[PDB]
Design a protein around this ligand. Sequence first.
Ligand SMILES: N[C@@H](CCCCC(O)O)C(=O)O
Ligand SMILES: N[C@@H](CCCCC(O)O)C(=O)O
Ligand SMILES: N[C@@H](CCCCC(O)O)C(=O)O
Ligand SMILES: [Mn+2]
Ligand SMILES: [Mn+2]
Ligand SMILES: [Mn+2]
Ligand SMILES: [Mn+2]
Ligand SMILES: [Mn+2]
Ligand SMILES: [Mn+2]
Lengths: 314, 314, 314
Amino acid sequence: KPIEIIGAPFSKGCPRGGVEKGPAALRKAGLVEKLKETEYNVRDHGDLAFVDVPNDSPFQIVKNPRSVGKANEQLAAVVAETQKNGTISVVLGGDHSMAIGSISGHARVHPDLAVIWVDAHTDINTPLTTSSGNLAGQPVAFLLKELKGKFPDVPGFSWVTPAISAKDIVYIGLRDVDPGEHYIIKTLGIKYFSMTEVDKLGIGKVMEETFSYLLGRKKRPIHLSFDVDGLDPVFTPATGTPVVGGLSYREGLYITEEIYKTGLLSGLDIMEVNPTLGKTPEEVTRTVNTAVALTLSAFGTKREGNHKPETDYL
Amino acid sequence: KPIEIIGAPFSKGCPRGGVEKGPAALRKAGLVEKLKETEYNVRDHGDLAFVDVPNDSPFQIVKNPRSVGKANEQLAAVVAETQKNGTISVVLGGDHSMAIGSISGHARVHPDLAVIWVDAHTDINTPLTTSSGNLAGQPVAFLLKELKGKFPDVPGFSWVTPAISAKDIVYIGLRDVDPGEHYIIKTLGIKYFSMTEVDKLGIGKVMEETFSYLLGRKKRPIHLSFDVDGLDPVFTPATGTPVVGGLSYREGLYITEEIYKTGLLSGLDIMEVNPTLGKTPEEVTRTVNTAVALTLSAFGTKREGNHKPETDYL
Amino acid sequence: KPIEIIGAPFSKGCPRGGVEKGPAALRKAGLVEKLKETEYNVRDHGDLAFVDVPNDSPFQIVKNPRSVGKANEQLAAVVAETQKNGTISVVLGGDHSMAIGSISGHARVHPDLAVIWVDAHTDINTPLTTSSGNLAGQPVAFLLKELKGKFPDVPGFSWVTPAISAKDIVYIGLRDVDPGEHYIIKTLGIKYFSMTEVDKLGIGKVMEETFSYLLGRKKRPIHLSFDVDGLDPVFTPATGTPVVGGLSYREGLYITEEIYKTGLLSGLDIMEVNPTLGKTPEEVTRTVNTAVALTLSAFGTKREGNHKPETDYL
Ligand SMILES: N[C@@H](CCCCC(O)O)C(=O)O
Ligand SMILES: N[C@@H](CCCCC(O)O)C(=O)O
Ligand SMILES: N[C@@H](CCCCC(O)O)C(=O)O
Ligand SMILES: [Mn+2]
Ligand SMILES: [Mn+2]
Ligand SMILES: [Mn+2]
Ligand SMILES: [Mn+2]
Ligand SMILES: [Mn+2]
Ligand SMILES: [Mn+2]
């Protein structure tokens, strides 16, 4: 199978500059080379150049609407393109608002896809419920069919078409949900495993249930959108919104290993790695290294080890 | 329901000064204000002023018997008072010996209560088995009916009446038990979940079983006495007796979330937070923040999020 | 029962000097004295003096073959000796290549023994598959019957006789396996629990299954070879090859407590503690303390506590 890396060095979805450096840090750490050592064919599409929209006045509270909307329209085109040729898209993030274009483009080719969202946050604030106008905390609002027309149209997002329904998404790692977002997920009946369900069930049973929930009836392509703050700050400190009590390095790897095993991974996002937020170089190294490890895991690297087929090592 | 915060800035139960500053550190962190944001009515009773008993000679090995006994008699009066008015008492600790007064006063109003003791220690040394005369390590000995008359009467504790039996207490987090204490809990048949049972069963099943054990027959008020050293030193380093290999931040929260869900929480103790034992300011901040988080969790704050009823956020 | 401590201050099995100081650091921490407090009879055999083989040229890639082979022949003699007298051998390590002599000598007296290998590594590289000539990463290759004649005879190891088969060993904690090693364990059908199986099953079920697999048919002596890097670097940082995402302090203790409970522990290795690799004195202290705790746990120390029989503490 073929893999195509797409860098999305974008940061206007939130106030902290730095996430745009995310793709560079991950490549610097050898992500592309290490992926070529796996059984997959890898092609690096490079980083997308995003045109800045001058005079991007805020829409009510929403900041940089046009710049975010345009960068995402462009990313959706690119992803739809690689998906069309039958390759697996891997988006290297800047902030999580880029999931709008990544999932939109992916859905144009695979309308029946399901989403596994690993994050400490639901990122489902609508333009009306946000306390901040930050779009990195609103991606899912723009993608849900059930949320269509529940918020005013935003400048730069008219090209977006709600592609997935509440039944096609599963959250894992939740521990920082605003009152409004909580209201939304409860009202829409969205399946989720907050840190309390992970604690109660154990990550092994959590994965069992998300698969029987999303793939029980029909086997369909999987889009894994992975926000690095889903893991505890001890493992991924270099992020914009760290929340204590998260997933461990082990649980994160367990999630990716199980997803690899389904044979259905179709799209992947590695978001919110911000190199400038590390208090010490080691903190940045720690964050980048685990992001790389999670990516390699999604493509076959197992902790029990790997050996090339047909090679008699004796 | 109503909540009444009662500060017990007391430290004579152990040799390390500093735990008396516990209540102040917790209030400083906004504990009271954060509690008012929950669905509960909060009333801060302030800190109790404890009269120091001059010439408090040790009783054999037991140190400061009269001062500890008197401070606890006074606390028991206060707690009995608030319990009588039907409010939930929350004692902010200095050392764990204050559980004597806290549980005694609580039992006067709710004689059928059950106790969930979260601690790395059993704190059940009798005045005869202690290696040190420290009373913070003997609370439970004074409260058990089955231990009545098994140790000489101590100066200052004649007002105490053993209120609970071995059948009404469950320990969680044990990992540092003296030979004598171990002998006692085995002989008396006290239910406990040491770190090895937590490791074996997972915190989810541990809570299931402590509830079926204490509430299986009759639903009764629950008193949760929480020693902050029950959690691993990595989360609560600012305590007098830290022991490695404890409960994680996540498991601690899981415990409080489950207790909140029973709807039976009646009394709560947040003990052993000693601000002067942090090696760095951050260590104190870390300890205070998790103590606050545990308290809020006992009163409804969920990791999956919270939203106010009747408020249509759309 | 009797315990005999045997120090193996050896480091030629790997490039990083320092592991030879392992035994001294462990004794310095009071290992021997603390063991005497248990129900066992303890005898310290002291440290073995290893004769250095001059002009030890490398065998192809393999470094210090003769020195490693000789030190192991000597250790095997000593262990066979103590095993013969019916005592439990406890080898305090330098590097893991010493498991060759420890297990070989043990098997001379107890041919039906089974091995529980706790390590982040399989240490099963053959002289032909190693990327480095380091012997600490090849112990198991020399011990497996199924690997006999699959690699050239090495200078200094002609005295070795493959004592155990693929059916008698179980790995726990794997997370860093070379392609060749992975090929070997898959081809030979060796039972293992990598960190992913520990994540999926939980340490409780992992122990259940390793016991039903190794002791289901016949109860036999157990040899526990414990590489300290099996635990996460946060608990045992002072080792030569730390790998993130390992067993926790709690899981490590759970393993030893369950092994103690079988009543079948016959041989124990505490390997790879390297005092010179701690970045701070506290890191070395942390590493030595958990190694001591694991050893005491193998011989009865429980987290729920211990009390001496026939002693009425009341
Ligand atoms: N719920 C917050 C936090 C958003 C952070 C989301 C992150 O995943 O991109 C907000 O809506 O502003
Ligand atoms: N078991 C020790 C430790 C007591 C520490 C108890 C703490 O929870 O207050 C002793 O009895 O002195
Ligand atoms: N697989 C590596 C790592 C060996 C480290 C083994 C350690 O347990 O002694 C190698 O074979 O060199
Ligand atoms: Mn997030
Ligand atoms: Mn996110
Ligand atoms: Mn304690
Ligand atoms: Mn206590
Ligand atoms: Mn190892
Ligand atoms: Mn090893």
